[PDB]
RNA sequence: UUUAGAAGGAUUGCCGUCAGGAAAUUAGGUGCGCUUAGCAGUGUACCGCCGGAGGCGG
């Protein structure tokens, strides 16, 4: 009996991200050794001439996803919702889309143009009072998403569980090593002031939006329309819409949108792969509404 | 093509007559269409075949000359008089008649019906609405012509129609009476000039301006009209004027 | 082929003197703003060389 989106309905992100803090160190001693990173006035920043790393630190808070809804003017509408991902944590425990978030982490994507040129990288994931066995970073492709490793699957275990019910929240904490060298230009994130290039400060230091290393650990679409001929991942957008190559690469049929109306509005099984890309929609959140 | 309609926009007339003996302000619809008759045979005398069957009259600002008093009311002015023929023609100081002027600007949308109907046809009239008048009055300046197709094209104004059930369903013994009632209950009316009606009968006189035509005495007729908006016209026949001719009877009908 | 066709309104000027707006007041009780997000066209255009303006090397 429903006939079409509520006149409010809104959800919450259920990755949570921390903003990024820059140091700088050595790197036979990184273990035991941490300096500030600042900025030098258009505006700069660039190493010592005494250390070669930059260490780059941030957080993540996992939040299950049925109690995530913020508003919904139809109690139907809800139950209808509640139904349809309490089906897929039948099937697929939210595997498939962790253990992409996972590798999305391993191959150091969060590095944004500070990757280019670096000799050896290492990315270490500690979660409660236990660290995981660090990431080589380079022996990852930005193509391909591996299946196979064991600290992959024994951290995306726990990261499913959570968007699933089992445990109510996850705190992990990574930490990273980039090796570019002695007096070399670090390239932090930069502020619309709305001249110059303002770059950001966090506390003194520099560091990196959490918008940006949040898109980059949601570019896990694999499953658009033309993906033969273009191959790369996408970010997961609504009207898929990757700023690079400016042109929608979900314009139609296939769009959140209508397929969302094509599963509750109006009973169709989907195939797996649309269902992987609706629940990510839905970890990533929005003001999926109508203009009743 | 055949039909067509071409629009005359924004056409400016300075000094046209306002006086038709109980009435002072628009000028008379038989000049407004008889406008159209003169440049449909200034036209038909340089060949290009053409006839002009119906006017509309879109009103977008007007001035009368004169001033208005503290009062409220109208005071109207005349140009001086100078050398009129008849007796006292030698003398330097002439006499005083009865006389308004009024300027307008206004629009005009000609249904026009030829062999061909295209913009060579709009460069012709371009060419003679130079040497023409309107109303006794002379043309300053207009903006372009061109072809319409539809009712969204005609530029924002207020058109005039005829509303003779009005008049004829009033309340009064004569219809002078109805025509004063009509007017006090509805205040968007005005009282217009709509032809000619015979006094005598048709014969050849003395004293003609043609002494090779057919000659009747006349008295104006009067009737009612009301303006209507651009936008919220339904047709593009709800408005425009025709010739229409009884026996004993000069007329100028919407319908 | 238009209630057609025609038209010099013009010269001059002292508005002035005086004045009490004034007394009184009770604006009040309630309340969810709130889901989402990558700032730059390469971040600049450097040394010379011919050659009386137009060119060429790194």
Not at chain 1, 182 to 189: H, L, N, T
Not at chain 1, 258 to 278: A, F, G, S, T, W
Not at chain 2, 147 to 163: C, K, M, S, V
């Amino acid at each position: 009996t429903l006939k079409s989106r509520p006149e409010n309905l809104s959800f919450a992100r259920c990755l949570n991200t921390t903003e990024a803090k820059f140091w700088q160190t050595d790197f036979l001693k990184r273990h035991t050794f941490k300096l500030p990173l600042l900025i030098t006035d258009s505006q700069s920043c660039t190493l010592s001439t005494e250390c070669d790393t930059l260490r780059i630190d941030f957080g993540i808070k996992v939040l299950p996803v049925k109690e995530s809804m913020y508003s919904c003017s139809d109690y139907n509408y809800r139950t209808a919702i509640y139904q349809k991902i309490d089906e897929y944590i039948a099937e697929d425990g939210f595997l498939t889309l962790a253990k992409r978030y996972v590798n999305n982490i391993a191959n150091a994507r969060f590095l944004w143009r500070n990757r280019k040129g670096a000799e050896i990288i290492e990315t270490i994931v500690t979660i409660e009072d236990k660290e995981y066995p660090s990431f080589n970073s380079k022996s990852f492709n930005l193509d391909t998403f591996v299946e196979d490793n064991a600290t992959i699957n024994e951290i995306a275990q726990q990261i499913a569980d959570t968007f699933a019910g089992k445990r109510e929240y996850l705190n992990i904490y990574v930490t990273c090593f980039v090796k570019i060298g002695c007096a070399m230009e670090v390239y932090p994130s930069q502020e619309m002031t709305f001249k110059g290039k303002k770059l950001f400060k966090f506390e003194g230091s520099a560091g990196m939006h959490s918008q940006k290393i949040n898109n980059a650990l949601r570019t896990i679409d694999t499953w658009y329309p033309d993906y033969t001929t273009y191959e790369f991942p996408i970010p997961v957008e609504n009207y898929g819409a990757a700023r690079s190559i400016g042109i929608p690469f979900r314009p139609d049929t296939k769009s959140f949108y209508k397929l969302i109306d094509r599963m509750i509005l109006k009973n169709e099984d989907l195939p797996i792969e649309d269902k992987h890309y609706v629940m990510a929609i839905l970890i990533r959140g929005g003001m999926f509404s109508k203009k009743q | 093509m055949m039909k067509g309609y071409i629009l005359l926009e924004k056409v400016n007339i300075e000094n046209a007559n306002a006086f038709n003996n109980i009435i002072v302000g628009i000028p008379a619809i038989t000049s407004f269409l008889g406008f159209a008759r003169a440049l449909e045979r200034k036209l038909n005398a340089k060949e290009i075949a053409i006839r002009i069957n119906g006017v509309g009259l879109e009103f977008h600002e007007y001035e009368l000359k004169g001033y208005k008093n503290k009062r409220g009311q109208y005071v109207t002015s005349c140009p001086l008089p100078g050398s009129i023929p008849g007796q006292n023609e030698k003398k330097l100081d002439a006499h005083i008649m009865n006389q308004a002027y009024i300027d307008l600007n206004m629009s005009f949308l000609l249904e026009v019906e030829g062999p061909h109907v295209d913009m060579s046809t709009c460069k012709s009239i371009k060419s003679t609405m130079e040497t023409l008048r309107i109303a006794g009055g002379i043309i300053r300046n207009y903006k372009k012509i061109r072809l319409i197709d539809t009712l969204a094209d005609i530029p924002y104004g207020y058109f005039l129609t005829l509303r003779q059930d009005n008049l004829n369903d009033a309340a009064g013994d004569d219809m002078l009476d109805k025509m004063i009632h009509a007017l006090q209950q509805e205040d968007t009316l005005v009282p217009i000039a709509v032809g000619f009606k015979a006094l005598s009968e048709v014969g050849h006189v003395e004293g003609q301006r043609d002494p090779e035509k057919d000659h009747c005495f006349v008295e104006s007729i009067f009737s009612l009209g009301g303006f209507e908006c651009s936008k919220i016209l339904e047709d593009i026949n709800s408005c425009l004027w025709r010739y229409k001719t009884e026996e004993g009877l000069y007329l100028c009908t919407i319908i």
